[PDB]
Amino acid sequence: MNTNNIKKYAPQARNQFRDAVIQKLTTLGISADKKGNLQIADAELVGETMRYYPKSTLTRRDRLVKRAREQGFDVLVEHCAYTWFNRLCAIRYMEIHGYLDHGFHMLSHPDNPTGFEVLDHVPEVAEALLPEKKAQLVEMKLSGNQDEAIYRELLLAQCHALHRAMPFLFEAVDDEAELLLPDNLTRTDSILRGLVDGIPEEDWQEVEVIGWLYQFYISEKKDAVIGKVVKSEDIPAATQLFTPNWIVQYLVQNSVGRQWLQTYPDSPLKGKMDYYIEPAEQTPEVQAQLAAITPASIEPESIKVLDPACGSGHILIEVYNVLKNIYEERGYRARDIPQLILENNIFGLDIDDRAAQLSGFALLMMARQDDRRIFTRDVRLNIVSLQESLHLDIAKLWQQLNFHQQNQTGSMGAENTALAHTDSAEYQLLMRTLKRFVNAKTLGSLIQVPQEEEAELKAFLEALYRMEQEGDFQQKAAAKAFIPYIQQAWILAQRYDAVVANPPYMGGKGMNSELKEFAKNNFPDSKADLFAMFMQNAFSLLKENGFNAQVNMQSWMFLSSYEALRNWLLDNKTFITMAHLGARAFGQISGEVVQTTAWVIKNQHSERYQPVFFRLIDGREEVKKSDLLLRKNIFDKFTQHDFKNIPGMPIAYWIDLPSLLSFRHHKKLGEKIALKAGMSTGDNIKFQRYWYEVSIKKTLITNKESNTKIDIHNIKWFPCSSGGEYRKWYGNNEIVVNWENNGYEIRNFKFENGKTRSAVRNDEYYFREGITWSKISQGNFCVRYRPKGFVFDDTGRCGFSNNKNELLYAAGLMCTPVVNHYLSILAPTLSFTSGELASVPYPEIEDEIIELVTNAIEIAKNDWDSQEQSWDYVCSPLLEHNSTQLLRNIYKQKINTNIKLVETLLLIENTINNIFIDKLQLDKTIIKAVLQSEITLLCNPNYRYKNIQDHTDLTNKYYTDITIDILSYIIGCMMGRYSLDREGLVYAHEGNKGFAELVAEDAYKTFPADNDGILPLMDDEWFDDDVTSRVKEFVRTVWGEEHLQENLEFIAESLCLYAIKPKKGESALDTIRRYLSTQFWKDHMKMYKKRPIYWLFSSGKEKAFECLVYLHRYNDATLARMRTEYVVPLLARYQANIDRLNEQVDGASGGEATRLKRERDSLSKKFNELRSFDDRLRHYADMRISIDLDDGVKVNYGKFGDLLADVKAITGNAPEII
Ligand SMILES: C[S@@+](CC[C@H](N)C(=O)[O-])C[C@H]1O[C@@H](n2cnc3c(N)ncnc32)[C@H](O)[C@@H]1O
């Protein structure tokens, strides 16, 4: 069958049917305004008509006004449009299979694509349906022009004809419902055509279509009610799916068919059950147990099955099929089985009056596929939809009932007449029943009813059937009103051999006010979501040896918020079989939003029982099915007693055995170590910084050059562990938080009313030595060491211990694939909090691992401290070897050192993993050894460039970041941030203050530092303090005028590698200059994560003047000096050559004069752009803008409007063009 047709039609069909009811209700007068307030205006009385229509069609009219005032105008239309659609859908299905007694098609015409067969056989069709109006209808057909009048009469006559067998869908007292039937049913634009035209006939063969009609009708109102709280009337929309047939079979066959096969093991139904999971080999003790409960025989018509949420009845249809083959096998006549199944075996509930309308239809269409006279028998269907009790005239009906026959009939009977036999066990049983179904359109089948009231209700019910059949008008009007409630109560008091359902799914963030309190007070173990309450309630609906079988979300197997429930299941019930599906089990939902599992749980507790699991998480819907059938991916080694060894007690069949026997033999991790969540500052943008953004004087960072005692009164910034990226031993020392005055600002940080926004937690553990981890990590789990002088927030959780060895032995553990083996178990998410991480095992201490971890952390710390983004940065790693050697040879010397360390840490990490795996007695096959690509070091090209698979292009890209990093360090020495003479960071505080002292102290005597802190970054050599100029002065001052040219050609060779595009004949010197003016800005953006310490003042898009400015060295007089000594003298040289280039264009010709014009044209564009960058720099230079370094980089960079480059990529806001 092709759903793609129904999926497109049914949503459109819903709304279609709805406007046709509004348009007919507007005539009917029942109407609401835009605000949902109802309007009557009563009804005109033009003699014997009600103009807006007959006046016998008034009373009936005045019962819509009644019901609409009882529910909701929106509701009315949403229901009645559905009922008719369900009716017409029921007719369409039934006319294709020729189920009609008159044997003519009703909605279509076989030999005419546009017509209606009931129109040409008016005499025959009328003879069957309306024998009295035959002379009239044969007269209107002979008028040939009243077909819409005629067809409106036969079609209404057909639905009436179907009320005898299907009273739940085709009601007969629907009087008002006839006034809402649309006209023009006989036109090419009737609503009817889409129902026929949108669905080919082959889609109608099988019955599942009923469920796809079901699922796509309401699909649209679903997309409007998701994410929000769901109204009591929107529930059927928001929770309505459709189970694949292969899951239902697995559910029905492993519950119903299980019990039958449990008594008659050599039943040929086992071959007829493809999804029947055979029982695993039990211990002799359980083997004695199960035989003691299985009855020696089961009679077929003693089995009773319940779907509490049938929906389309898709599950009942399969129960019907499983029961069908049980009756055949027992020796029962063919025709007699449907009645016995639908009356003695199949019972179903739901809240959507219109979902039952389809479900019962579906069972009757399966029954009509087997017995032609099931439509002649009084077949009571136990498929009912739940009804509220806020609209009953209870005192009016119990006196209309005359159950004990109190009114001797005939005594014409007063507004104070004491309700007689209010003490009768039919009244007290009736009132207790009407009190249980108050908000039935909200609770559904979760309402329990005591089994003790079973007998009294059925005897009351059958009597309510009798008196519906033998009684007078009041007793038949009355006893017809009470049956829906006495029946639905009778279904709830009854217990069943198997409950099969695909329950509804709704987390505790769409439940409405009414529903929530019902969960806290009645289902505390499973108050989180609906599907769980159905799981725990369904057990209250089974016999002792009964089977609960559902297909549920998987979260009840893991989330600690179900621990009380998971604890409850293991103690009282017996898991039988479970097929864990995971995602994409339903081939018609989109997104990884739905993860499921189907299971069967006996209502008896057996300890030593051996259940069978199927891990079918992979593939589309088709695959799990194929692997389920082929019995791929089977687990049958763990009893339900074994799953109690895991903190929280997760259903965790995927576990093996030595990992289960290690939770019991060893001690918990977060027990030993104080897993503490950090503060929550409330605002990470106000309080947290990158350490390079602020003055090093104003940080708790102990510099290698400030022996002056850190005055803890001037200290504003303290290094803060704030989450970050994966890392296995030490990095991420990048965030500093504002902790001045012991956090006076974070502590008093309040909202508007007075409540406190931040959440300073565990501030006793601050500045301690400990570890840390990304609380949130996409990949594996990893921890890093954390020295003293740090704080930490909630994004960077930290464990602490008093023993440094345990602090390392833990840090060595929490980084293995072994830990990521457990964290899969306790909580398969990306959240690595302090609660599941605390339940991790943790064995005795070995002294070997503590050295391997000390070596590993210093390998990792040496790795981290090597970049200029770290505070502990000393100098560029090239400057560790002799300064006579050739530069290309020093590159080679450094790479070989960087591969040995990867192997060492890899051999260390794998030695650590292999030691833990030996102690916990684990399986090295499950825990793979660490690979070189996972060694979390920045010198490992495999890890830094995960995306590049090559070796050459991997090696080249490595040489390339190596050549850029040495350029940003030289640009660093130009500004004054580092120095050859002095180890470590040199100058980094506000206002260019104290820089000059350093110069007088020969802080930069080897390589001089730029005077003003303005470096022109240009593509041709104008100034002498140009960047590309001083770089050569650097290489010359370091490696030798001897080597200058090959070291420079090798730099040219290496920039060209990945950084920029080479050019033939381009000197080493030109090659370098090109990079700096164009690409360096971007790499420095990336290098500092869009937080530049060197600011590129840019004239504009012609790159007429670009200069770098070091952030710390900035003062008021800079933009005045920037204009005095750079922007002013440069606009003078541009002119003395536009004039010299015009002395040559007139003195040249041919190919050279066209070359001097493009050199004069290009030079004049850079003269107008730097003329308006001067008109705009003079603007910002007068302002004497003086910065504050504590403010941040995203703020100051907007203070200059568009003078700087990438103002909208750094600040976010487009540059404010002053
Ligand atoms: C049961 S599943 C759909 C049934 C479908 N035949 C299948 O294969 O699963 C979702 C349906 O459950 C229905 N349902 C039944 N009983 C319910 C209850 N007590 N509360 C809410 N929804 C309920 C909802 O109306 C919704 O349409």
Author numbering: 1 to 52, 57 to 417, 421 to 1225
The authors write:
Bacteriophage Exclusion (BREX) systems recognise and methylate 6 bp non-palindromic motifs within the host genome, and prevent replication of non-methylated phage DNA that encodes these same motifs. The PglX N-terminal domain encodes the methyltransferase, whereas the C-terminal domain is for motif recognition. Our data demonstrate that PglX is used to recognise specific DNA sequences for BREX activity, contributing to motif recognition for both phage defence and host methylation. As a result, the PglX structure, and lack of nuclease motifs and potential aligned catalytic residues, supports PglX acting as a methyltransferase only, and not acting as a restriction enzyme.
Following crystallisation and data collection, an Alphafold model of PglX was used as a search model for molecular replacement, assisting the solution and refinement of the crystallographic structure of Salmonella PglX bound to S-adenosyl-L-methionine (SAM), a co-factor for methylation. The structure was refined using all data collected up to 3.5 Å. The crystal structure contains two copies of PglX in the asymmetric unit, the smallest repeating unit of the crystal. However, the arrangement of the two copies allows only weak interactions that are likely formed due to interactions within the crystal rather than being biologically significant. The architecture of PglX presents two distinct domains, N-terminal and C-terminal, linked by a central short hinge region (residues 654–659). Due to absence of available density, two short loop regions were unable to be modelled (residues 53–56 and 418–420), but otherwise the full PglX protein was resolved. Within this homologous domain of PglX (residues 227–661) sit the amino-methyltransferase motif I GxG residues implicated in SAM binding (residues 315–317), and adenine specific motif IV responsible for interacting with a flipped-out adenine base from the target DNA (NPPY; residues 509–512). PglX eluted from the SEC column at 11.2 ml, which indicated a hydrodynamic radius of 54.8 Å, matching the 57 Å calculated hydrodynamic radius of PglX. These data indicate that PglX exists as a monomer in solution, supporting our conclusions from the PglX-SAM structure.
